[model samples]
Target: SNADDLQMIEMHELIQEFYYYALTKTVEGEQALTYLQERGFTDALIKERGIGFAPDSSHFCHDFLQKKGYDIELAYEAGLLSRNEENFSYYDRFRNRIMFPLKNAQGRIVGYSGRTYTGQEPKYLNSPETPIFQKRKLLYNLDKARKSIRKLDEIVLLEGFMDVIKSDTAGLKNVVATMGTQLSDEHITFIRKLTSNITLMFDGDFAGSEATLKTGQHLLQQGLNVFVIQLPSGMDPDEYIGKYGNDAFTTFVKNDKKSFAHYKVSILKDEIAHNDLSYERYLKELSHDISLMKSSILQQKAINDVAPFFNVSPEQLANEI
Candidate 1:
């Protein structure tokens, strides 16, 4: 409902819930927004995401919401209230971490999730789903980027909530993520609001590649203009920026980009062949690598553009797929 009451109802509740659990709770692994902001996640972006911090305080959100007429029972159901045999009290669900707001489809804040900066345990802490919130159905900041995604003609899919935010900071705002690397048809349809093109930018590590390949196929099958912007030396966009300046990074994406099919070919060559001096095997391996691209019409065009360098025929290259 576009009615102001229904939207604002959960919005304030969402703000309270997010600040409570994400900032006030003890979670692990660079979870705090302050940690990320200090680590280069911008404050303006944080504010756009309605990110906040929870000081180590007791019953902050409970008292606040009670004064605003939210039912005690609903708060409890929403993970904002805690009970004990001796007494019932209001406490912040998130303690000592930075906050990332989770908004419903209508773009109203419905819940809060937290992450901690230091510890060996779970790196992220998420709010338990309530009546207004469901993990699978929500994409962080979709409300903010929905219009932009539509105008841009594409969306960049990412590996995490922050990764989506960072993508915007990196001048690539048409982006979204699957919380923790899980994707669904529902997720795809939600993103379809934005564009037909989809780019899955994952880390260059082993776990990352596994996610990329798995997610990439489903995206392609959905009839997306799917591309992979994988890094060269095992880096995601954020880490890669440290290795290369943002301008250089943007240039890398703009000038030398390849489809996942092409990247797969290039990566296989990098992996199997040592491109060092005087290695005939390396050159032969490179030739063999180019031979593997899938035979879609678009792929054949790509083969045409790339094959001449290796002096290979389209039929010879077709054998590799």
Candidate 2:
């Protein structure tokens, strides 16, 4: 709603749309803009709006949009340029990178996003939190996914921007990403507005598990239903499809999915047994973890099922359970 506070953005004067239209093949301006817009953008978005990439200011996106009446200060505020003390102007962002536009709730261009190809450090570079773009509070593609999310009553949260795009590419809609590691309360509230069921699919690794746990905890606190699908050890969705093929990987996913509660105890129990902790502390810790599960019904029931390994009474273990 930042647009509510600022002057109405004039669309016809936006020059960046011309190049975007050019990059996408279409016979005319309106057709090209409409093509990109239908793909989750509008004339007011950063990539569709007057923001662009020029190899450098000598010529490219900088002078391109500048000549069209976009102020230099506005350009800099949009993260479209870099200024040096000598009055030197440069385009320091999104050079030679694939551009991903950010859209607001109204499906207007709020800001631009840039992402590098595989094996690049800082794999994704998004617009910094500006007056309109708050990364923690925004969900990419929500404008497009909102209807489906409402109708389907669930959303599959993925690991990266492309993961969602790939699902879109493959025609498996209703998937989104949290830009990974940004598990803010604002984010949970945002998702809560659309769906109660959230299926988390994190890459199979220690760090991925950590991210899952963090986001899972947040979703649980928000009173949303949460589940997770872990890829095979040491691989992600991309790697899995590459190694095993997409159809086979899809079958694998269907066959092997555990509620976060079951998976959490299953993983930790094996480790506890491997380390050979004292029977007393081991049972206590395991019970404590089950208690942390989001489903209270399952939590209490799990105490009885998991307590047989040690001769402890479920009532005696009540505090941790």
Candidate 3:
């Protein structure tokens, strides 16, 4: 056990530098660099995030690690190398991909998330959980965003790593992402330490609404201030910003945020029965959601806004609740 821990820590440190060297100096890295630039990622950001590219060859990292005096088994188990089944030889796990180092709140590298510039199956791949890396326990870019989050008293939560980088380019440093995983209690613990207010910025689609709904419910239950920014229909934060420029995207986030209750109405009102019976049914469902908030002030505020949106009086919605 002690040996494994030592191997993994050394392997993590070595592999991080190895990947950075490959992405910045090698011929293959040049291509990956182009891919990042084309996607609107600046050189500063690539370096800032310690982003790099792995050569397409299977033996690049494999040979590098072997020569660097690493146990191939430890490397494989740490998720940096793969093994051949028939011959039991070690190979690289991340090939021909742009690597984003996954860092902790203290900015120490722990794991990685790789993205393929070319069309590849599983366009994004992550290091499998190890003794040191736990997906449920980490949020991307927390080390950098913590200061801005404290200053602003809020966190802008996005669904993608690139989205956080893009938001960063827009001068929004108070942004973080859940690596497309559910917002776990471990995440909330990190979040509450910095701020209580969070804004969910997801894609403008059914999937996005569902994510907001699920995350919003959790934040409300936890007694945090949850807000939502509905992107233009069918657009992701990356695409929207690219299409509309950074300043435009920043302005949109500032001006278009909705309280969780208002967001509920935006997503659920379309699924309703417009007439008397259906109206009552929809109101009851909404009331149940509003009741989740321990704050009567929030409950009443949501009802007041929801009543006007549905063309009903506050008393009518209250009666249903």
lDDT of each: 0.63, 0.61, 0.83
TM-scores of the models, in the order given:
0.74, 0.74, 0.91
lDDT (Cα) of model 3: 0.83
Tell me how candidate 2 scores on lDDT: 0.61
Give lDDT tens digits, candidate 3, residues 48-125: 777888788898878877888887888888888888899988888888888888887777677788998888879899
Measured over all alpha carbons after superposition, the RMSD of each candidate to the real structure, in angstroms, is 6.5, 6.3, 2.2
Higher-lDDT candidate among 1 and 2? Answer: 1
lDDT of 3 at 199: 94
**Backbone clash pairs in model 1 (N, Cα, C under 3 Å; residues 3+ apart or in different chains), count:** 15
Highest lDDT against the true fold, candidate = 3
Which residue pairs in candidate 2 have backbone atoms (N, alpha carbon, C) closer than 3 angstroms, thus clashing? 44-109, 45-109, 54-61
What's model 1's TM-score? 0.74
Q: After superposition, how far is residue 209 of candidate 3 from its true place, in Å?
A: 1.2
Model 1 C-alpha lDDT per residue in residues 254-313, reported as the tens digit of each score: 665566555554544543344444234433544443333333565666556544444567
